[PDB]
Antibody, heavy 218, light 220 residues
Framework: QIQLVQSGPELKKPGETVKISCKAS????????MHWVNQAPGKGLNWMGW????????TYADDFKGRFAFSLETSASTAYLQINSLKNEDTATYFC???????????WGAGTTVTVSSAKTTPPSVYPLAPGSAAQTNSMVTLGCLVKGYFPEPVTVTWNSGSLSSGVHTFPAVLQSDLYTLSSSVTVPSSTWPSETVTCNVAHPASSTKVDKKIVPR | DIVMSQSPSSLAVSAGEKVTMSCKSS????????????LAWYQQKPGQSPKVLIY???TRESGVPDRFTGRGSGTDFTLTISSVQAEDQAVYYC?????????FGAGTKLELKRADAAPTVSIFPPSSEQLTSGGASVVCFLNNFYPKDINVKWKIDGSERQNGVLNSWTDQDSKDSTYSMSSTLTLTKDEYERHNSYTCEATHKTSTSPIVKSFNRNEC
């Protein structure tokens, strides 16, 4: 199969440099051009340009001339994108994609999110959300997990190591004063909790935080 | 640069209905050598990379259902989706590769309509753990409702509290087309223990009166 694997999320301060990678497999790397497309949070797709995988020569769209550089490591079938003198506006997700003669991208990397910020990395505090000790109980019960005060994104939140997948809602993190806050809820039959344990597993890669918070009755 | 103009910016239809979106290019995308229009359509779901649906203006990529149909030549193009389902919720982009730089349209966001649904509201007092430090966050989940338009008001001892609240909405559900939202009111431990009644009121068109969930501290 054909696949493009991009490097992990990057946190950089303004004025710094970042270099991300896109590893290709399943096809002859040098037989197809590699293109780069970026996307600012909540906005549209922007074509940055492409690299000739045979020649190595890059061509940039006007909006990306100057600070951007496409390079290759042919032997490792990998394409790179380096951005110089980062600006807060460079905060976005960068995708690599293989271009076909039929003029379309048939395969894309999952994208690499780079956030440019002066904010300092900080681990989240994880709090269990259980119904009040004096609240009415129904047929179903909803539990929660509050992941507060961390930076930067992302954080992963699952329930019972993933075994509990239905009835789950994880709300998009919101930024406030250099810190993100996110929450997640799970709804299970009242006959399953608290008799059966329910725990939220949260991880914040940037701070190597990993906590498995069991939700217990108050 | 060739400008791609997509319309409408957003579409809302019920499951099973047909939808058509337009993409107009600032100049013909017809290649005389191949006799093909270099126009492609891509579908991008929340948190995912785009995926091609149509290329050469009307050729379906292998794996794409017949219900997705691309039409057009020159400057006028369209993408039509029949038997629309929640699974189709995404932003659709057209892209020309006739003359560099390749350019994308602004996209058309497809959202689904469905029966109105009242939110299931749950309120959660601050956790013992959070209290141990100097904080206190009260959380209310408003789950599986429709439409997306909803208002949450926080009250402490009966009076509205506007500062310190953070709200977040999920993307439309990929299966049942509902929305969910979380509202978090953060206060200091002192403020929290200085008052007794905490309630979040949800105002939604599904009810003439707001849904109220509350708890009293001294009852904990």
């Amino acid at each position: 199969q054909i696949q493009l694997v991009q490097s992990g999320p990057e946190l950089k301060k303004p004025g710094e440099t970042v270099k991300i990678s896109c590893k290709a497999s399943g096809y002859t790397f040098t037989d197809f051009s590699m293109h780069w497309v970026n996307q600012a949070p909540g906005k549209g797709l922007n074509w940055m340009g492409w690299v000739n995988t045979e020649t190595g020569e890059p061509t940039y769209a006007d909006d990306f001339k100057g600070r951007f550089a496409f390079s290759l490591e042919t032997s490792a079938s990998t394409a790179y994108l380096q951005i110089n003198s980062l600006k807060n506006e460079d905060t976005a997700t960068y995708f690599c994609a293989r271009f076909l003669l039929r003029q379309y991208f048939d395969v894309w990397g999952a994208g690499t999110t780079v956030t440019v910020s002066s904010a300092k990395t900080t681990p989240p505090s994880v709090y269990p959300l259980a119904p009040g000790s004096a609240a009415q109980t129904n047929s179903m019960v909803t539990l929660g997990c509050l992941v507060k005060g961390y930076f930067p994104e992302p954080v992963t939140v699952t329930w019972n190591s993933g075994s509990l997948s239905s009835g789950v809602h994880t709300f998009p993190a919101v930024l406030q004063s250099d810190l993100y806050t996110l929450s997640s809820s799970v709804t299970v039959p009242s006959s399953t909790w608290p008799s059966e344990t329910v725990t939220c597993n949260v991880a914040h890669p940037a701070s190597s935080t990993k906590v498995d918070k069991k939700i217990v009755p108050r | 640069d060739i400008v791609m103009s997509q319309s409408p910016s957003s579409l809302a239809v019920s499951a099973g209905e047909k939808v058509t979106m337009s993409c107009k290019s600032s100049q013909s995308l017809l290649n005389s050598r191949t006799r093909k229009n270099y126009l492609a359509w891509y579908q991008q779901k929340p948190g995912q990379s785009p995926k091609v649906l149509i290329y050469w203006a009307s050729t379906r990529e292998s794996g794409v259902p017949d219900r997705f149909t691309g039409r057009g030549s020159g400057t006028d193009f369209t993408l039509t989706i029949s038997s629309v389902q929640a699974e189709d919720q995404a932003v659709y982009y057209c892209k020309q590769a006739y003359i560099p730089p390749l350019t994308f349209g602004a996209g058309t966001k497809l959202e689904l309509k469905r029966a109105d649904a009242a939110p299931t509201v749950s309120i959660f007092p601050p956790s013992s753990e959070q209290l141990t430090s100097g904080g206190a966050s009260v959380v209310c989940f408003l789950n599986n409702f429709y439409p997306k338009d909803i208002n949450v008001k926080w009250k402490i001892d009966g009076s509205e509290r506007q500062n310190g609240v953070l709200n977040s909405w999920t993307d439309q559900d990929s299966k049942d087309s509902t929305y969910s939202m979380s509202s978090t009111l953060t206060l200091t431990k002192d403020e929290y223990e200085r008052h007794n009644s905490y309630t979040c009121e949800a105002t939604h068109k599904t009810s003439t009166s707001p849904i109220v969930k509350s708890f009293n501290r001294n009852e904990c």
